[PDB]
Amino acid sequence: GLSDGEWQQVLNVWGKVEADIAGHGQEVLIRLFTGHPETLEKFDKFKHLKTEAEMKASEDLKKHGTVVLTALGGILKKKGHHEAELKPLAQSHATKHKIPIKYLEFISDAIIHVLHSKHPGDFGADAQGAMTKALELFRNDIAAKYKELGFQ
Numbered sequence: 001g002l003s004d005g006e007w008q009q010v011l012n013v014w015g016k017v018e019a020d021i022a023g024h025g026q027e028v029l030i031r032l033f034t035g036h037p038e039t040l041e042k043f044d045k046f047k048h049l050k051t052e053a054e055m056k057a058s059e060d061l062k063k064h065g066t067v068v069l070t071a072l073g074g075i076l077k078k079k080g081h082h083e084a085e086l087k088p089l090a091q092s093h094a095t096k097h098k099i100p101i102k103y104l105e106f107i108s109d110a111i112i113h114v115l116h117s118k119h120p121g122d123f124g125a126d127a128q129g130a131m132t133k134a135l136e137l138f139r140n141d142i143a144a145k146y147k148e149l150g151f152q
């Protein structure tokens with residue numbers, strides 16, 4: 001649960017992402033894959049990537065970063081009223097992709113890391129707090145759907 005002022009911060013931060021969605025999306029995925037190499041194994045289309053240089057050169061990885069962040073941005077713009085948008089993603093990630101909730105924690109922390117890395121000194125303490133709360137809400141509502149499905 002976020003206040004109006006917290007949502008305002010989230011959507012202000014998101015404007016930084018929307019100025020370069022592919023560059024942010026690329027770096028988020030690279031931070032996830034290099035920090036948590038077990039996550040790469042969930043992607044049949046990226047498992048061939050052995051080095052970070054290959055990851056950086058992959059145009060398909062940048063494409064998938066755009067898909068991921070476009071979906072998250074659509075959810076965030078709903079300011080918590082995201083049941084219809086979140087349900088298919090929870091279902092696909094539990095039943096088809098088999099993504100444990102732990103990996104959604106990993107990607108949430110990776111988003112925070114990338115924002116500080118690309119905007120050092122321009123991602124303030126209030127903005128980090130609000131973004132963290134929004135990603136927690138997203139993860140918590142997915143977790144409720146995972147429990148319904150019995151997925152671990």
Ligand code: HEM
Nearest residue numbers: 039042043044045067068071072089092097099103104107
């Ligand atoms: C911010 C969190 C994330 C969002 C919004 C997101 C969004 C999406 C979207 C929109 C798709 C395509 C449609 C679909 O299959 O439902 C997708 C595919 C996928 N997601 Fe996620 N995702 C997230 C996190 C993750 C994480 C943490 C993993 C794995 C560690 C992952 C693994 C996948 C895989 C394996 C695919 C299929 C890729 C392919 O072969 O085309 N997702 N995701």
